[PDB]
Ligand SMILES: *[C@@](O)(CO)[C@H](C[C@@H]1CCNC1=O)NC(=O)[C@H](CC(C)C)NC(=O)c1cc2c(OC)cccc2[nH]1
């Protein structure tokens with residue numbers, strides 16, 4: 001099951017940011033509003049913007065911030081700065097419902113929750129994994145820029161994504177909160193090509209373990225491939241590096257099946273499924289992490 | 299096409315923990331009323347054959363402890379208690395100051411809704427399920443999840459449709475509507491129960507094929523057509539639900555130009571075999587996406 005964190009924490013932080021005739025979502029934490037910087041850019045310049053000239057041309061009053069959740073309010077902007085592909089706006093009132101938070105960058109294969117927003121109003125939530133080519137496969141429509149992606153550890157939200165674009169293949173990307181765009185895509189209105197996607201090997205392993213736990217173990221055999229041998233094969237068949245984790249070990253102890261058997265099985269199941277099914281799938285499944293398998297199948 | 303849930307913040311502000319004896323589970327706080335599954339009155343020795351009428355009469359308002367954890371912690375004093383089908387309807391003296399606009403409508407097979415999974419009154423995760431024709435759902439419910447709540451949102455109104463009660467040996471799940479009746483008439487006792495046979499949700503297979511077409515996957519479309527009446531008599535023989543068209547479906551017909559009866563014909567052929575070919579990454583029919591899903595996500 002694709003399970004998301006409860007989103008109420010993050011809903012209380014979503015705002016609408018308007019600049020000239022551009023409008024998108026922003027994140028209100030304490031005295032700061034984060035939002036994508038292209039809100040500054042008029043339409044006649046989206047294809048080829050000069051963000052530094054645009055930033056100089058803005059004043060605090062160029063920016064309009066509104067809260068539509070709970071007690072609606074207008075937030076007075078009293079400072080503006082740019083950080084990579086984000087604007088960092090300072091407002092005069094602190095968000096009284098600010099969670100404990102950090103900013104982290106997610107590595108490919110890691111899962112996180114997304115709150116999709118339109119005009120500062122939360123509309124849906126879903127879970128994604130960062131692909132090896134630094135894209136995600138969510139559902140983002142018009143007005144979804146500034147929607148936020150995050151994980152939770154205890155009561156602390158770790159913010160990891162702010163939405164910026166949709167590639168022509170329907171896939172999506174955005175920034176970490178240091179301003180850097182995932183996959184180095186540029187925040188301008190141009191057709192851009194992503195690198196070839198790969199399978200997240202550790203996720204495929206975790207999924208096969210989940211199959212065995214539910215009683216589906218047909219692919220299991222005594223044939224082993226070593227970690228180092230599998231990884232050499234992976235470079236030629238568009239798989240990531242396998243890296244072991246204690247999470248994967250838990251799933252090998254409980255299952256009594258070695259990673260090396262599953263690594264061999266991956267090579268053979270990639271060749272083809274020979275007609276059968278694994279957990280309702282006829283293709284490899286790489287969007288469930290070892291942590292998901294550990295928490296869901298007990 | 300992706301599994302998508304409503305934002306859960308509205309519902310999180312309504313969850314409470316309900317304790318009775320050595321028993322504890324989740325509750326839903328709306329106005330002055332807390333709903334929860336009635337088996338919280340039963341001790342675990344007796345769950346196999348609970349005497350719910352006798353349990354209710356032996357309970358006093360002090361037999362129930364309702365605790366709110368999300369936000370500012372408080373104990374909610376019980377000043378009334380009643381039973382309605384498989385649910386308890388407790389009256390507390392403090393009205394929930396964050397009660398959303400809501401309705402209580404039972405969902406039909408093939409409809410999708412969002413679940414807030416909770417443990418001892420604390421929300422832990424959210425996901426979407428669809429009600430199967432055998433009145434089960436397939437989410438992720440662990441120990442302590444009874445009282446977790448299922449819902450849909452239209453505009454500002456929350457429609458509460460599901461209160462979690464049980465896990466079948468199949469790994470599948472069921473619970474109550476908020477009128478107190480159990481989906482599929484499963485009984486709320488610690489006994490083995492076998493669900494009825496599943497079916498494919500016909501109207502959702504149609505929606506998914508429309509989604510295939512919109513995304514450039516249309517090899518399965520032929521000129522050939524099966525009427526709704528002819529398809530439905532076939533559905534009875536082949537474990538499909540009766541196809542009932544809606545405006546939501548017709549919208550997809552118009553955007554694509556592929557009529558409903560073309561997809562009904564295609565389904566009959568696809569159910570016999572995809573012949574190695576794929577539709578949206580699948581070698582099998584998919585019925586977990588509704589027409590509304592396809593409209594919102596692809597248009
Ligand atoms: C945000 O709403 C914008 O603030 C918007 C979200 C997408 C609109 C449709 N679905 C979405 O997810 N983002 C964009 O419009 C961005 C803006 C950039 C970062 C300045 N641009 C694109 O997503 C974009 C541009 C182009 C393109 O050009 C030419 C050609 C093809 C695809 C494409 N996507």
Ligand SMILES: *[C@@](O)(CO)[C@H](C[C@@H]1CCNC1=O)NC(=O)[C@H](CC(C)C)NC(=O)c1cc2c(OC)cccc2[nH]1
Pocket residue numbers: 322323337345346439440441442443444463464465466467471486487488489490
């Ligand atoms: C609630 O958390 C309980 O308050 C719990 C939820 C399930 C636990 C695992 N996943 C869930 O959805 N509910 C139960 O444990 C209920 C309680 C009964 C009605 C008193 N029981 C079952 O779901 C149950 C009992 C049995 C069983 O017996 C023997 C045999 C097989 C399956 C089964 N399920």
